[PDB]
Amino acid sequence: KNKCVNFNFNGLTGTGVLTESNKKFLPFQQFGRDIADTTDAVRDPQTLEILDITPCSFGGVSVITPGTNTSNQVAVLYQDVNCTEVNVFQTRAGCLIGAEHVNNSYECDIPIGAGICASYQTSQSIIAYTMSLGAENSVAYSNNSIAIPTNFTISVTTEILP
């Protein structure tokens, strides 16, 4: 048990991890299913032990890669996993292997997920950090203070629409 194995009982077969459960089964039942026809629970024939059918570590493989004329260092990032079943940092989308965690918050250049982004800092290396939502600024609010602009400039922006 407790592995990514292929279970084959007298009434149910498939592939899943037999983890511990907290439900309450009936002595004449054999297994249990989910709402939309998904087997997620099994029962031993003559042993008081309730086990679930946990799916193994699966998901897409997303690789953060730089340009072909800039750098060659990449990182390994799997989806919907942890850092135990697989520069190691755990995120909500999966385990990020190949990036050192930095407490300093910088500008989000490459998105990863759950507020975590990566950048290329000096020689270039992939880092893991929480993205910055903007520059901190405390407005001097008062009842008898105002800021009237005296100098101006002319800036022309460009917006592209199909």
């Binding site: 939309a36 026809d37 989806q79 919907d80 998105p111 990863i112 997920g113 507020g115 901190e136 105002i146």
Partner: protein
């Protein structure tokens, strides 16, 4: 604003790690890849429709400790930093909203980052007014900022100076009526629940198609190979592949049309968070019924809650 990000693989959903099932997927060419690139493009557009509406100001402003804003009570809309900064209204907005290749991934802009984006729009409209949306953060008192909103709709500023205590009781009591309405009436948040009804209820119908026979003699790939001959089981397996890919061609079509409706709503949500919030909309009945003064946006799961101030 956006929807729930869910990536469904074209391999693990059709074939349950079978060798003979994957041999027929190569005969279709790039039919497996076009279903994966279509579901991946929705998650890219969900991140684009989230950042273009919420992340509009490149500077995060904080609330000053001196809360002298003309006698108003902004404690119900300010997120508490001691608790995920959530206000008194946002506590009800989060609680009243509820295998084979199904990969659920969280988005980049989580709910903890929308509270800091709305805090810059809240402190920016009060302390700096409308100057931070066009240039630098120019400070201005809130008693004189509200007098300019009356001048845009043709109202003299003498009414604000003589009814300061009258506007402090009608506005602060109107916020509590919305908080009591969302807790009692559960049908008031049906728009946020409609995003779940188009994603979670649609995912429950997708797994039930795997148990369907689809005109074949069985619904399990292991039963057809073990019973029928290997030259004879390829006909009944191909009937299951043609039926299960039709379920994927229906789920991609029904979600991409609904993704265009959220993206069309994201263009309206970005307009109501810029024209109605950061400025003063001259459009009649755009911020709701009545003469629009200002608006304060709130965070919501896969959406946004508006609080328009009407006259």
């Amino acid at each position: 604003v956006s929807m729930t990000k869910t990536s469904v693989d074209c391999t693990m959903y059709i074939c349950g790690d079978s060798t003979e099932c994957s041999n027929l997927l190569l005969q279709y060419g790039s039919f497996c890849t076009q279903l994966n690139r279509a579901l991946t493009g929705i998650a890219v557009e969900q991140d684009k429709n989230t950042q273009e509406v919420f992340a509009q100001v490149k500077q995060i402003y904080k609330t000053p400790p001196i809360k002298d804003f003309g006698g108003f009570n902004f404690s119900q809309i300010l997120p508490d930093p001691s608790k995920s900064k959530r206000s008194f209204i946002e506590d009800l907005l989060f609680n009243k909203v509820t295998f084979n290749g199904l990969t659920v991934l969280p988005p980049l802009l989580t709910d903890e980052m929308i509270a800091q984006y709305t805090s810059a729009l809240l402190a920016g409209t009060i302390t700096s007014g409308w100057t931070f949306g066009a240039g630098a953060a120019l400070q201005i008192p809130f008693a004189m900022q509200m007098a300019y909103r009356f001048n845009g709709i043709g109202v003299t500023q003498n009414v604000l100076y003589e009814n300061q205590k009258l506007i402090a009781n009608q506005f602060n009591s109107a916020i509590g009526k919305i908080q009591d309405s969302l807790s009692s009436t559960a049908s008031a948040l049906g728009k946020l629940q409609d995003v779940v009804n188009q994603n979670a209820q649609a995912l429950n119908t997708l797994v039930k198609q795997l148990s369907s026979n689809f005109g074949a003699i069985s619904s399990v790939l292991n039963d057809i190979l073990s019973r029928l001959d290997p030259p004879e089981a390829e006909v009944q397996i191909d009937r299951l592949i043609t039926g299960r890919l039709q379920s994927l061609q229906t789920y991609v079509t029904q979600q991409l049309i609904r993704a265009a409706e959220i993206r069309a709503s994201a263009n309206l949500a970005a307009t109501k968070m810029s024209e109605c919030v950061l400025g003063q909309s001259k459009r009649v009945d755009f911020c709701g019924k009545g003469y629009h003064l200002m608006s304060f946006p709130q965070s919501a799961p896969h959406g946004v809650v508006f609080l328009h101030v009407t006259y």
